[PDB]
Structure 1
Amino acid sequence: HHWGYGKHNGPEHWHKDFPIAKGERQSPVDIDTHTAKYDPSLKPLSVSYDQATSLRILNNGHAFNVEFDDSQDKAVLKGGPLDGTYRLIQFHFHWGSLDGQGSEHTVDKKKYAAELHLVHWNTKYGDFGCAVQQPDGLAVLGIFLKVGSAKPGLQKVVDVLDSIKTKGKSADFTNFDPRGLLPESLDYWTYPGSLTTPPLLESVTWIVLKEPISVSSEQVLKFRKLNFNGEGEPEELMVDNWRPAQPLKNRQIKASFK
């Protein structure tokens, strides 16, 4: 059928409808720190989220998305490996049924409890629809979550998740500040890759922050109460909505830091 994370429609099945799933530049990957060399040429990263305008939060049956008004150079990502300006369009997470798994990228094989993806598109292209088709069209900032102290910037999201329990539900979600989801360090790894959900388009410059953020067990448990299923259907808890590591193939992962 259509795609999900189950035994019958999960990542091992995706290539049938989306052959690029077996492509040369698929994400996520394992980051081997011994081989991901420091690159002194990487300009530093500019995460500029002060004018971010959140619009809504919605459960799309795979995760939940927080959508932003990307009509102006409000919330943008620049510098680092990027040429030009990338507008924030949406963020979502991937998480596990147990703390020991849930991230899409891994670092020396370590899996984090969850992974946040802030998705941006290259203003070279006019809108998200054109950008997503081009190898230089997207940049996704990925941030690892580990379980520890509460992330206070995540609480506004956690406290609305009751209202979007099931597939197709959404809610107005204004004045959310994504700066509240960043760690202290902007140190990062970068490589060229893909969307980690169908259609798996190889159009993403990946920027994956070294420093995880901490979130509390209560916060993660609230992610784990969401449903993959639509209302009235049998319960299928939305957990383990991660694709595993894909072959690195001919690519290099470069580190911004020594």
Structure 2
Amino acid sequence: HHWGYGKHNGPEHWHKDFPIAKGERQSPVDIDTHTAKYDPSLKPLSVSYDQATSLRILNNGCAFNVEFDDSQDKAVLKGGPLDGTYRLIQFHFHWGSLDGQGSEHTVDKKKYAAELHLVHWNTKYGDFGKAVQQPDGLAVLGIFLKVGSAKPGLQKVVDVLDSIKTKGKSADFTNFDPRGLLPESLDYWTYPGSLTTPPLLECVTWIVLKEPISVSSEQVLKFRKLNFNGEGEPEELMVDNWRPAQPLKNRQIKASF
């Protein structure tokens, strides 16, 4: 794909091919914690990952995706602002070149080192590609990463990155438990938005956890050794693969706490 994160094809350029980039419900956004309102109508969030079946990890030239078997309700998200059942299809991260940037969402304008997106699709639409055409097709669980203590549950991801350095490379990645990437609290903010990469479809209910997870400098450093390019091409470190905050326009962010 043409688009990217370079100064010639980055986020400021996307609108030329994807005019929805200047749409009414684009993501990410800044979460103003003093404007977000507690919503007692929200039901408890249910993260049901015990039967998760990971398959593979893929460098797709933009991030790396850990892919799951979504042929059955094996790892689902329910509750919270959601109606129905949303199946985990993949997770990926966005991260920076420096520890002071990398997240897509911001919290009172604070940028985190990275942001994990666990992507789920609404089973009432039958498959992911149909779901992304619907305003309630996806539910993305967003989790901030800050640099501190190592995250043990991330280390298996870190250790395979050497095997998917360049675009198009994949590796088997079975028996990975995504529960190890969750913080202790499931307190979140929620709002209607979009994919944060082209095609930027406005199909996401965003659920952004308040509590970050901590990862070590060594761990995030390993993310930064990935490459955007394909093998045998000049090296372009995979860093700063984040879209900045977009206008909130006619939306309200709700808090679960």
- Which interval holds the TM-score relative to the shorter structure? over 0.9
1:115 matched to 2:115? The reply is yes
Residue equivalent to 1:34: 34
Within 5 Å, which residues of 2 pair with 1:97-246? Answer: 97-246=97-246
Query: C-alpha separation between the residues in 1 aligned to 2:176 and 2:197?
Result: 25
* Equivalent position SS for 2:9: coil
Query: C-alpha separation between the residues in 1 aligned to 2:41 and 2:131?
Result: 26
Superposed displacement of residue 121, structure 1: 0.2
Superposed displacement of residue 216, structure 1: 0.5
Query: C-alpha separation between the residues in 1 aligned to 2:180 and 2:20?
Result: 34
Query: C-alpha separation between the residues in 2 aligned to 1:173 and 1:227?
Result: 19
* Equivalent position SS for 2:15: coil
Query: C-alpha separation between the residues in 1 aligned to 2:35 and 2:147?
Result: 27
Superposed displacement of residue 212, structure 1: 0.1
Spell out, residue by residue over 1:67-105, the C-alpha distance to the aligned partner (whole angstroms, 9 max, x if none): 000000000000000000000000000000000000000
Superposed displacement of residue 186, structure 1: 0.3
Superposed displacement of residue 11, structure 1: 0.2
* Equivalent position SS for 1:251: coil
Residue equivalent to 1:7: 7
Q: Any stretches of 5+ residues in structure 1 without a counterpart?
A: none
Query: C-alpha separation between the residues in 2 aligned to 1:58 and 1:134?
Result: 26
CA root-mean-square deviation: 0.6
Spell out, residue by residue over 1:197-235, the C-alpha distance to the aligned partner (whole angstroms, 9 max, x if none): 000000000000000000000000000000001111111
Spell out, residue by residue over 1:158-200, the C-alpha distance to the aligned partner (whole angstroms, 9 max, x if none): 0000000000000111000000000000000000000000000
* Equivalent position SS for 2:109: coil
Query: C-alpha separation between the residues in 1 aligned to 2:82 and 2:202?
Result: 16
Query: C-alpha separation between the residues in 1 aligned to 2:37 and 2:81?
Result: 14
Query: C-alpha separation between the residues in 2 aligned to 1:39 and 1:13?
Result: 36
Query: C-alpha separation between the residues in 2 aligned to 1:77 and 1:141?
Result: 9
Number of corresponding residues: 257
Q: Any stretches of 5+ residues in structure 2 without a counterpart?
A: none
Residue equivalent to 1:250: 250
Superposed displacement of residue 240, structure 1: 0.2
**Deviation above 2 Å: which 4+ runs of structure 1?**
none
Query: C-alpha separation between the residues in 2 aligned to 1:123 and 1:59?
Result: 26
Superposed displacement of residue 5, structure 1: 0.3
Spell out, residue by residue over 1:22-59, the C-alpha distance to the aligned partner (whole angstroms, 9 max, x if none): 00000000000110011111101000000000000010
Query: C-alpha separation between the residues in 2 aligned to 1:244 and 1:92?
Result: 17
Identity across matched positions, percent: 99
Query: C-alpha separation between the residues in 2 aligned to 1:151 and 1:207?
Result: 21
* Equivalent position SS for 1:207: strand
Superposed displacement of residue 7, structure 1: 0.5
Query: C-alpha separation between the residues in 2 aligned to 1:243 and 1:32?
Result: 18
Superposed displacement of residue 112, structure 1: 0.2
Query: With structure 2 as the length reference, what TM-score do the two structures score?
Result: 0.99
Query: C-alpha separation between the residues in 2 aligned to 1:132 and 1:40?
Result: 28
Query: C-alpha separation between the residues in 1 aligned to 2:252 and 2:170?
Result: 39
Query: With structure 1 as the length reference, what TM-score do the two structures score?
Result: 0.99
